[PDB]
Design a protein around this ligand. Structure first.
Ligand SMILES: CCOC(=O)/C=C/C(=O)O
Ligand SMILES: CCOC(=O)/C=C\C(=O)O
Length: 297
């Protein structure tokens, strides 16, 4: 469960992010010993990207390079191999997607929503690593940027976000065999840029922005009861946070609290319904991509 491949543990990788400008950092945190490693920079700076892992490879998807010399939304898919410590371009998406949400089903990467200039996407596309090919699938019922995405029981959920006019509490679910999206129970809070993940049988939505404050509240959707319930709030309000699951606990990384770009990383224990601080990143940032895979070489 803890060991992967050769004889190694798994790390929490954070890629990219934003502080003053879009960042190229790739760093990996080890919950077993508290250590941080700096790894190979992304080829192109990006905030607002998502991260995921397939076959042990780390993928960086979408985003936007906010640089003083120009701002460029990204359709880019790039893959990091922990065994070589090298980034490799993959095929690009049909469209640039900043503030994207990503989920993995059946070894396939789903890219959801996001923005391209003043365009807010409802479009969705699926990537097949064995063929290095993107194909559009059915669009969402809602245009969503800053959308959180999670996978539960081989179904993909798109949660919260912003359609261009209002921040959203709505959420919806993709059924792959019917290529069909259906709305589900909305959250009890409007959230854009929330951290969205799955733990046991629930989809969590932590933090985000409700249109006037960054949030510390956290809720989770029990798919069996189709209801949202608040759990314990985080210790920091945060928006544009990184999130992932590691050994049964939820990790939230950085974000913006309305005053500071956070370096705080918090870990949620579901058994005790408590959050603790477990480390800080090397520097404060928002809009990172986060995933978990094997230790690098
Ligand atoms: C069917 C392909 O699935 C994978 O290769 C998954 C890898 C992973 O979750 O690391
Ligand atoms: C008021 C401009 O919009 C924001 O500033 C939105 C979110 C955030 O900081 O987290």
């Amino acid at each position: 469960v803890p060991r992967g491949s050769h004889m190694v543990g798994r790390l929490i990788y954070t890629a990219g992010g934003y502080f003053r400008q879009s960042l190229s950092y790739l760093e990996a945190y080890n919950p077993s010993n508290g250590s941080w490693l700096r790894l190979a920079d992304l080829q192109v700076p990006r905030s607002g990207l998502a991260g995921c892992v397939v076959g042990g490879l780390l993928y960086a998807v979408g985003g936007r390079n906010n640089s003083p010399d120009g701002n460029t939304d990204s359709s880019a898919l790039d893959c990091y191999n922990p065994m070589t410590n090298q980034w490799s371009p993959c095929a690009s998406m049909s469209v640039p997607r900043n503030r994207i949400g990503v989920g993995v089903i059946d070894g396939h990467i789903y890219a959801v929503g996001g923005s391209h200039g003043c365009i807010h996407h409802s479009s969705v596309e699926r990537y097949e690593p064995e063929r290095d090919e993107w194909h559009l699938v059915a669009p969402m019922l809602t245009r969503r940027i800053g959308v959180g995405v999670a996978v539960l029981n081989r179904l993909l959920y798109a949660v919260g976000g912003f359609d261009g006019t209002n921040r959203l509490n709505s959420a919806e679910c993709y059924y792959p065999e019917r290529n069909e999206w259906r709305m589900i129970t909305p959250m009890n809070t409007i959230r854009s840029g929330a951290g969205v993940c799955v733990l046991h049988n629930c989809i969590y939505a932590a933090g985000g922005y409700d249109g006037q404050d960054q949030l510390n509240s956290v809720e989770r959707y029990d798919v069996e009861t189709e209801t949202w319930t608040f759990v314990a709030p985080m210790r920091h309000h945060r928006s544009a946070l990184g999130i992932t699951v590691h050994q049964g606990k939820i990790y939230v990384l950085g974000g913006y609290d309305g005053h500071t770009f956070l370096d705080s990383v918090e870990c949620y224990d579901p058994d005790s319904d408590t959050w603790s601080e477990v480390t800080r990143m090397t520097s404060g940032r928002s809009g990172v991509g986060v995933a978990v895979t094997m230790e690098p070489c």
